[PDB]
Amino acid sequence: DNLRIGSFGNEVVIELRCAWREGVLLEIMDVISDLHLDSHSVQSSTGDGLLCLTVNCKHKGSKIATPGMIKEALQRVAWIC
Amino acid sequence: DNLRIGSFGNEVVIELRCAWREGVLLEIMDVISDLHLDSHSVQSSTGDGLLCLTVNCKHKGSKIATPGMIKEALQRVAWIC
């Protein structure tokens, strides 16, 4: 819910803070890949049991599936604190 | 010289620079997961045609793997440059 996403060119930027669970980071990037997004740059940190994550990714092809579908897909596997 | 790996107790740190290919970042992390390592923190950036990556991971269970295995396993999908 309290996670933002932005688009400029062929690139998408995701900034989210969620509750940490074992393997959640790999799952989040897997959903990003399942959304036809190739993650090139990641900045992440942990603290107080929370994981702060920023992902800069680009589309593997067309701009298909880049609006709010990321939010629903990400919320399926991550609990935004 | 090449990309280095370190181990301290149950914690592992991976820092590598490799040639950028589409989808290589998730594949490297999948290999890290294939090494029974749970990645909690990832730092990655692109530049020229190279990908610089630093991964902080923990062992997924008592099935402890070894560094030389990590070096060889990572090279299967990433070209260290």
Curated annotation (Swiss-Prot), chains A, B:
Any idea what job this protein has?
Answer: Transcription activator, when associated with MYB75/PAP1, MYB90/PAP2 or TT2. Involved in epidermal cell fate specification. Negatively regulates stomata formation, but, in association with TTG1 and MYB0/GL1, promotes trichome formation, branching and endoreplication. Also regulates trichome cell wall maturation. Together with MYB66/WER, promotes the formation of non-hair cells in root epidermis cells in the N position. Whereas together with CPC, promotes the formation of hair cells in root epidermis cells in the H position by inhibiting non-hair cell formation.
Tissue localization of expression is:
Mostly expressed in roots and flowers. Also present in stems and leaves, and, to a lower extent, in hypocotyls. Expressed in epidermal root hair cells (trichoblasts) and moves to root hairless cells (atrichoblasts) by a cell-to-cell movement through plasmodesmata (at protein level).
The protein's superkingdom reads Eukaryota
- TM ranges: none
Q: Where in the cell is it found?
A: Nucleus
Q: How does it assemble?
A: Efficient DNA binding requires dimerization with another bHLH protein. Homodimer and heterodimer with BHLH2. Interacts directly with TTG1 and MYB0/GL1 to form a complex. Its interaction with TRY prevents MYB0/GL1 binding. Interacts with MYB75/PAP1, MYB90/PAP2, TT2, CPC, MYB23 and MYB66/WER. Interacts with MYB82.
Q: What upregulates this protein?
A: By nitrogen deficiency and UV light. Negatively regulated by MYB66/WER, GL3 and BHLH2 in the developing non-hair cells, and positively regulated by CPC and TRY in the developing hair cells.
Q: What is this protein called?
A: Transcription factor GLABRA 3
Residues covered by region (Binding with MYB0/GL1 and MYB23)? 1-81
Write the gene name.
Answer: GL3
Record organism: Arabidopsis thaliana (Mouse-ear cress)
